């Protein structure tokens, strides 16, 4: 058990990232694992993310994964980490199905909240 | 996680499971006493389970610490999931056992 560092810069397209969780491991049906699952996936470009989810991507969201599908986060992974170079870049947030084509994972852009996180910790 | 692999046990030491009678969300330890998760994981009562690998079997490294404060981003939007972020203050500091 140890802490992951907050990010020092926003996500960069192409960055290999580690996503993990105990969410569903199937696109169809459900198989919830007992053991923690890992996935290595690259950050997608801002244009690929918007093209995948037109009008629904705010400045506070970014996409990670594969436009071909097959590998993705899923139900039960919500809230978990997307980590690269020792920093927490993303939080599992939403997406259309799991590992569907043209439907990559959408993640909260943690960098945008670095000050909110420090301020909230200091006030509490 | 679809299409992934089983993580090496305790190789993801910041990964936590959020439990409210069952595993319902993940989160990340970011200091001794604070966890970051998604705003749509908000629940009024949350137990944070650190040091987990198999979440059904007690294997030896678990820390179960209840949330003392659960603070969702004030501009969280439940329809669009804009500002999907939440902070959890643990009732006690987690024991940092990884160097
Ligand atoms: Ca366990």
Curated annotation (Swiss-Prot), chain A:
Residues at the site labelled Required for specificity: 72
Coiled-coil blocks: none
Keyword Nucleotide-binding recorded: no
Post-translational modification: Sulfated on tyrosine.
Disulfide bonds, paired cysteine numbers: 49-63, 74-98
UniProt EC number: 3.4.21.4
Positions where Sulfotyrosine occurs in the chain: 32
Protein name: Trypsin-2
Organism (species): Homo sapiens (Human)
Swiss-Prot record, chain B:
Protein task: In the ileum, may be involved in defensin processing, including DEFA5.
Domain of life, source organism: Eukaryota
Subcellular location: Secreted, Extracellular space
Residue span relative to the full protein: 24 to 122 of 247
Family: Belongs to the peptidase S1 family.
Annotated S-S bridges: 25-41
Active site: 40, 84
Native source organism of the sequence: Homo sapiens (Human)
Protein name: Trypsin-2
Sites where the protein binds Ca(2+): 52, 54, 57, 62
Tissue spec: Expressed in Paneth cells, at the base of small intestinal crypts.
PTM text: Sulfated on tyrosine. Although the increase in selectivity is relatively small, it may facilitate digestion of a broader range of dietary proteins.
